[PDB]
Amino acid sequence: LKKNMVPLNPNRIIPDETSLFLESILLHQIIGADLSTIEILNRLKLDYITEFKFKNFVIAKGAPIGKSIVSLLLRCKKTLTLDRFIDTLLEDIAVLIKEISVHPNESKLAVPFLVALMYQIVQFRPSATHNLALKDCFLFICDLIRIYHHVLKVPIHESNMNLHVEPQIFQYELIDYLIISYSFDLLEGILRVLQSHPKQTYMEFFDENILKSFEFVYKLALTISYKPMVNVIFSAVEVVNIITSIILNMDNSSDLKSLISGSWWRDCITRLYALLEKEIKSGDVYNENVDTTTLHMSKYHDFFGLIRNIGDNELGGLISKLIYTDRLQSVPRVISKEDIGMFTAPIIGYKMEKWLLKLKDEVLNIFENLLMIYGDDATIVNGEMLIHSSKFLSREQALMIERYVGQDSPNLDLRCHLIEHTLTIIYRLWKDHFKQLREEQIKQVESQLIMSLWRFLVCQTETVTANEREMRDHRHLVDSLHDLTIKDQASYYEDAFEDLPEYIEEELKMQLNKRTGRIMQVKYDEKFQEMARTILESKSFDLTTLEEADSLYISMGL
Amino acid sequence: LKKNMVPLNPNRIIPDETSLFLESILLHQIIGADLSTIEILNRLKLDYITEFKFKNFVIAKGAPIGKSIVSLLLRCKKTLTLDRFIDTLLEDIAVLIKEISVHPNESKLAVPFLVALMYQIVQFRPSATHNLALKDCFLFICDLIRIYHHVLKVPIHESNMNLHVEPQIFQYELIDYLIISYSFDLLEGILRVLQSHPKQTYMEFFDENILKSFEFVYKLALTISYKPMVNVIFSAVEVVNIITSIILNMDNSSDLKSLISGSWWRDCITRLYALLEKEIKSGDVYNENVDTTTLHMSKYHDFFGLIRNIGDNELGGLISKLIYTDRLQSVPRVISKEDIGMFTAPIIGYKMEKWLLKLKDEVLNIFENLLMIYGDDATIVNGEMLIHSSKFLSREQALMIERYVGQDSPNLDLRCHLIEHTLTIIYRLWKDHFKQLREEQIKQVESQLIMSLWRFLVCQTETVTANEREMRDHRHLVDSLHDLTIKDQASYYEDAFEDLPEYIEEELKMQLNKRTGRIMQVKYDEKFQEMARTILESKSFDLTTLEEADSLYISMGL
């Protein structure tokens, strides 16, 4: 009688999730360092706080700090379940980071490793962390960054008499660069684990204090008059993405939007515009050059960080060489600043272009989001998304055609994805939001909008591709790198790319061909030809007159 | 239909027993030390083994050792289940103790803490440890002790010209005293966790090598011509107890007894006799006096150890003061030898008498066991258990009556339990083993046997107690300490001693009265009067003739 049902296991080992979390803390190790993070904190003392104690988390004067962390971890494993063990660790390590930070004399070497350890605590089980702990941790990291006021506020250019006679120390600069970078990365981590909660509970996180604190630290990160640290720019726009993504995908959308003032947005969007109008050039990414025009990713902060691996991690060997590893000390091991830098590969510049192109994709992606938040007209969906986005579209087509085609870099495709993306940021702005596209602001970009749409409608002629035989001879010229990519994907990393059945590689000699069309800047996708057609041709606004329009059409044929 | 059965739990949290074992290792702390054992091993390096590696247990030259222990513990938690995690730890820490030990120059400070950590590993779940690991660990601790050849072999008396001009260092002596004491305690622990296995599997432990190695180390512990360390005498007779206890309570009893040669027993029993004929005197327990007559428990090895808390732990403050606790070192922190010893309480002497009386109870308890092993006659159940046990019975009655009655020590009762026990070691020797009680050896003790039995049969007169009113006036004289004991037991530590229902304290004014009878050396228990009667009166052997017997009976009445 019903001999079908799947039988249970009578000895189900539900794994002790707090033990797995304990083990994930104990062997947490940042990428490039020689020792584990707890094993670094065992080698740190603090000799100006004579006795630290918050809630039975006693630290003696000459005691190792990581001894006290592992004593807390062992002591609170027996007692607490997981969601209490998390916020116990969060508030205890937060109070420790706090009184190491606000002190006149004491070195702050434990602070980066405690922030990274805190990030390991947060993102272990995001379903387990209650969001009031996330609120407390977010407020603590925001006013922790406003403690570290001076890392993101170095001036543009120094004095001419700034004599570089100096010990040329890097270890304190390396400490507070790690503090700022791990802090902004922890802000990104708090908001994605808050993003992963069920969608009825976001109001337990947000209040006025959250948004005012992030407004301050967001003005701090996306700087104007100071040297930009690009490591914090990635996370500081990814946080804005997480905000605009949960505003879309929640139910009580008004009480976020009522909590946000329009000044927050019109301070955010101008800095996003000023980020979007910067240049990406591989030959002087890592060079130090003119400000606020090239996203440059400085030599003196080049390491991975917590979420994503952003550079080549040139300063990861110096994290392990910041402590003496056989000694219990407080001041750092001395790192000379001018030893780094040795010249063999510009490929590092290509992948840093790849990250910066994903950054611009991120910025106009959150443009695409907050079009959909404020579908009705407001202060902020206000026509300058024609000006700045059309400037961006026109120049990233123009110097694509002038400079990039036939340069065999791997970053062509994504760079001709951005234009392919930002036309859509034009298009639904044109189609669904014309009621705020004012008559003067359209004439601020009448050159560049019409020229950018014309470089899509030039591709309806198509006397270039038309076959198969010579297009692969074009991709031997422009797209050999993606041939290497797809052969290494086909022979190693894809399940469907073996014993190819004479329909899966006819798809390949369809899609590599349309890809190399989209790279060669002739024959874009037909859907984008239609979207560019129904802005220029359509009669929502006289971009051109009919005797000016056919002056454009004769330069293709027509 | 059958709404009775107890329902299961659908979310049974079977606790991750290897995680609990991990946490028991990580907060293992010996009694009196300031730091945890892993936290002491984090402060130890080893600078003569340039690189230690056995099976991916890499230790660098200047690295902390406890870093490598906790790296093994975290790495082998994910992989192994519990019975493999145990013997992985056992062989790895054993190889580490080995190559720290066999080295000419290197200090051995890590060795006591690694042995104590190994003991914590063994006795956590004794059902989990497979007994081949116990065999390997027992063989390793036995040849580890024969490495430490010279701790248990200091001479009796030094030269007259042994000038005590010397650094007077104690730290190296404290190290290898801890090594020897923790090693013998680990031998006791291995054999009780082997005792706790199901009784069909003892042959997986024992072979010739086990018994030859313990024969050597047992001759080493119960010394003859060297200064005795009493800490190893307790465990070295408790091991013999565990052996003679499992020989009784197993099924394949012959293949142990065939594996044991009679020379092992007739080397063991002579040393047990020589231990049994020593004296216990509180006024010179802790004094240094004449050898092999007083069990003295020397001042320079007075700490707890692993199983039992044997002294007052005067050398436990010096275990934490053996390392610098803010430093990674190899040589010990210097302990001056003559600072210890400060005189306030002889009560410490009374509880050390209590432990030594339990030691003599242990020795004649294993006499009582191996009567029952060799119920048939052999080399070893051979009539000297009349001589030595009757010497012991007669003197511990004689100087009981001359010296101990009315001395208000807590150790009277157990001291008049020993006589009350050892009569039984007489009695079943007399009744069930007369066929080896040879005619000359009985006349070696004809004085002492008959006098000892007569001091039991003198109690059948009993004109002393006979009531209730004056016997409590006797226990105000001899047994006030047990009145304090039973009042503190009655008001604090016993569930049945409140709202006393006038039958539970009539039992008290029965059993305190028979107890103070048994202390006052008049009116023993009636069963012991019968057992002493049916040796003297019964006609198995002419102890007395009938004209010599009534010469004894007239000195009671009769």
Contacts of A328 in chain B (CB under 8 A): 326-328
**What string of DSSP letters covers A304-327?**
--SS---S--TTSHHHHTTS-SSS
State the DSSP code for B6: P
Run of H or E residues at B162: none
Contacts of A46 in chain B (CB under 8 A): none
Contact B90, B118 (CB under 8 A): yes
CA distances from B249 to A381, B245, B373 (A): 89, 6, 10
Q: Is A42 on the interface with B (CB under 8 A)?
A: yes
How far is B403 from B397, CA to CA, in rounded Å?
10
Q: What are phi and psi of A59, to 5 degrees?
A: -120, 125
Contact A180, A229 (CB under 8 A): yes
Per residue, the 3-state secondary structure of A217-228, as one string, reads HHHHHCCCCECC
B-chain residue closest to A76, CA distance? B23
How far is A299 from A348, CA to CA, in rounded Å?
12
Which SS3 state, helix, strand or coil, does residue A336 take? strand
Six-digit token string for A102: 């606000």
Question: Which amino acid is present at A65?
Answer: I
Q: Is A27 on the interface with B (CB under 8 A)?
A: yes
Say if residue B123 is exposed, middle or buried (CB neighbours under 10 Å; 0-12, 13-18, 19+). Answer: middle
Question: Which amino acid is present at B409?
Answer: S
Q: Is B39 on the interface with A (CB under 8 A)?
A: yes
Q: Is B37 on the interface with A (CB under 8 A)?
A: no
Contact B518, B420 (CB under 8 A): yes
Contacts of B12 in chain A (CB under 8 A): 12, 14
Six-digit token string for A52: 């630290």
Which SS3 state, helix, strand or coil, does residue B59 take? strand
Do the Cβ atoms of A16 and B13 come within 8 Å?
yes
| Sequence-distant (≥ 6) Cβ neighbours of residue B530 within 8 angstroms | none
How far is B298 from B352, CA to CA, in rounded Å?
11
Q: Is B13 on the interface with A (CB under 8 A)?
A: yes
State the DSSP code for A403: I
Out of B11, B15, B27, closest to residue A74 by CB? B27
Contacts of B72 in chain A (CB under 8 A): none
Resolution of this entry in Å? Answer: 3.2
Q: Is B328 on the interface with A (CB under 8 A)?
A: yes
Which SS3 state, helix, strand or coil, does residue A241 take? helix
For residue A363, how many other CB atoms are within 10 A of its CB? 24
Do the Cβ atoms of A23 and B77 come within 8 Å?
yes
Six-digit token string for A379: 């202060």
Number of A/B CB contacts below 8 angstroms equals 52
Query: The dihedral of CA B290, B291, B297, B299: what is its sign?
Result: positive
In the beta sheet, which residues pair with residue A294?
A279
- Dihedral, CA atoms, A398, A399, A405, A409, nearest 10 degrees? -140
Query: The dihedral of CA A267, A273, A277, A281: what is its sign?
Result: positive
How far is A443 from B224, CA to CA, in rounded Å?
112
The residue behind tokens 């202060």 is A379
How far is A489 from A497, CA to CA, in rounded Å?
8
Q: What are phi and psi of A226, to 5 degrees?
A: -130, 170
Do the Cβ atoms of B16 and A16 come within 8 Å?
yes
Contacts of B66 in chain A (CB under 8 A): none
How distant is the Cα of A320 from the closest Cα of chain B, in angstroms?
Answer: 14
For A294-326, give one letter per residue: b (16+ CB within 10 A) or e.
Answer: bbbbbeebbbbbbbeebbbbbbbebbebbbebe
Discontinuities after residues in chain B (C–N over 2.5 A): 342
How far is B271 from B239, CA to CA, in rounded Å?
14
Contact A122, A140 (CB under 8 A): no
In the beta sheet, which residues pair with residue A44?
A329
Contacts of A8 in chain B (CB under 8 A): none
| Residue B463, Ramachandran bin (φ over 0: left; ψ between -120 and 50: alpha; else beta) | alpha
Run of H or E residues at B101: helix B82-101
For B131-169, give one letter per residue: b (16+ CB within 10 A) or e.
Answer: bebbbebbbbbbebbebbeebbeeeeeeeeeeeeeeeee
Question: Which amino acid is present at B178?
Answer: L
**What string of DSSP letters covers A149-214?**
-SSS--BSS--TT----S--B-HHHHHHHHHHHHHHHHHHHHHHHHHTS-TT-GGGT--HHHHHHH
Interface test with B, best of A8, A9, A11, A26 (most B CBs within 10 A): A26
| Sequence-distant (≥ 6) Cβ neighbours of residue A298 within 8 angstroms | A227, A229, A230, A286, A288
The residue behind tokens 């304090």 is B484
**What string of DSSP letters covers B284-299?**
GSSS--STTTB----T
Q: Is B508 on the interface with A (CB under 8 A)?
A: no
Contacts of B327 in chain A (CB under 8 A): 328
State the DSSP code for B155: B
Q: Is B80 on the interface with A (CB under 8 A)?
A: no
For residue A362, how many other CB atoms are within 10 A of its CB? 17
How far is B285 from B278, CA to CA, in rounded Å?
12
**What string of DSSP letters covers A263-301?**
HHHHHHHHHHHHHHT-B--GGGSSS--STTTB----TTS
Six-digit token string for A10: 């009578």
Q: Is A8 on the interface with B (CB under 8 A)?
A: no
Run of H or E residues at B85: helix B82-101
How far is A393 from A423, CA to CA, in rounded Å?
7
Q: What are phi and psi of A336, to 5 degrees?
A: -70, 140
Contacts of B85 in chain A (CB under 8 A): none
How distant is the Cα of B130 from the closest Cα of chain A, in angstroms?
Answer: 22
How far is B26 from B235, CA to CA, in rounded Å?
26
Q: Is B67 on the interface with A (CB under 8 A)?
A: yes
Query: The dihedral of CA A82, A83, A84, A87: what is its sign?
Result: positive
CA distances from A271 to A223, B141, B279 (A): 8, 71, 92
| Sequence-distant (≥ 6) Cβ neighbours of residue A526 within 8 angstroms | none
Can you state the percent helix, strand and coil of chain B, rounding each to 5? Answer: 55, 0, 40
How far is B211 from B259, CA to CA, in rounded Å?
8
In the beta sheet, which residues pair with residue A169?
A336
CA distances from B151 to B112, B154, B300, B301, B341 (A): 14, 7, 12, 11, 22
What experiment produced this structure? Answer: cryo-EM
**What string of DSSP letters covers A95-148?**
HHHHHHHS-SS---THHHHHHHHHHHHHTS-TTTS-HHHHHHHHHHHHHHHHHS
In the beta sheet, which residues pair with residue A226?
A155
Do the Cβ atoms of A63 and B326 come within 8 Å?
yes
Out of A14, A23, A42, closest to residue B13 by CB? A14
State the DSSP code for B228: P
Contact A244, A369 (CB under 8 A): yes
Contact B61, B47 (CB under 8 A): yes
How far is B115 from B111, CA to CA, in rounded Å?
6
Q: Is A78 on the interface with B (CB under 8 A)?
A: yes
